[PDB]
Design a protein around this ligand. Structure first.
Ligand SMILES: c1ccc(Cn2c(-c3ccc(OC[C@H](C4CCNCC4)n4c(-c5ccccc5)nc5ccccc54)cc3)nc3ccccc32)cc1
Length: 149
């Protein structure tokens, strides 16, 4: 369909340049990466400080480029523990100018009434699956395996 072709074109022109994650309370950068974690069909790996699990809120700064215009750029993200979804997040960026480079800031909060398992239990058993959309059009699905160090 025209929609499937369009999703492939957006993926072709898309790149995640860098990303960092901060403790939202202190503003200190806990993790930073320049690997494009959005690339589909390969399991990405990331080693993060185990103390990030104790942050109630984590602030993300995601820098991306897009050759293609997007009307409603957004993400759906699920955290899986041994294949079971523990949590889901939705974030909306909106309009993307064709051939632009943008920095997107998000606040990722803990789900209320939930207790974090120890880092030693979680390490290597957590997969964060991210779906990139333009409105209801799925552009890509990528996965990151987490190690808490
Ligand atoms: C590094 C980290 C994560 C990614 C994946 N990734 C993200 C993303 C970032 C932070 C996220 O935070 C989710 C939680 C926080 C929530 C607030 N309280 C502390 C725990 N979290 C868990 C956790 C929650 C619940 C249960 C078990 C574990 N493991 C964590 C490990 C690190 C930080 C927070 C972690 C959720 C999604 N954006 C992306 C955009 C594009 C591509 C990939 C992207 C990539 C690299």
């Amino acid at each position: 369909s025209a929609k499937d072709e369009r999703a492939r074109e957006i993926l072709r022109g898309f790149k995640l340049n860098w990303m960092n994650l901060r403790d939202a309370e202190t503003g200190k950068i806990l993790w930073q990466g320049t690997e494009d974690l959005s690339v589909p069909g390969v399991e990405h790996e990331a080693r993060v400080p185990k103390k990030i699990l104790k942050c109630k809120a984590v602030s993300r700064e995601l820098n991306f480029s897009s050759t293609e215009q997007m009307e409603k750029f957004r993400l759906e993200q699920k955290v899986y523990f041994k294949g079971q979804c523990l949590e889901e997040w939705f974030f909306e960026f909106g309009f993307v100018i064709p051939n632009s480079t943008n920095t997107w800031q998000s606040l990722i909060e803990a789900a209320p009434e939930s207790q974090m398992m120890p880092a030693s239990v979680l390490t290597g058993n957590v997969i964060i699956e991210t779906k990139f959309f333009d409105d209801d059009l799925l552009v890509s699905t990528s996965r990151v395996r987490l190690f808490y160090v």
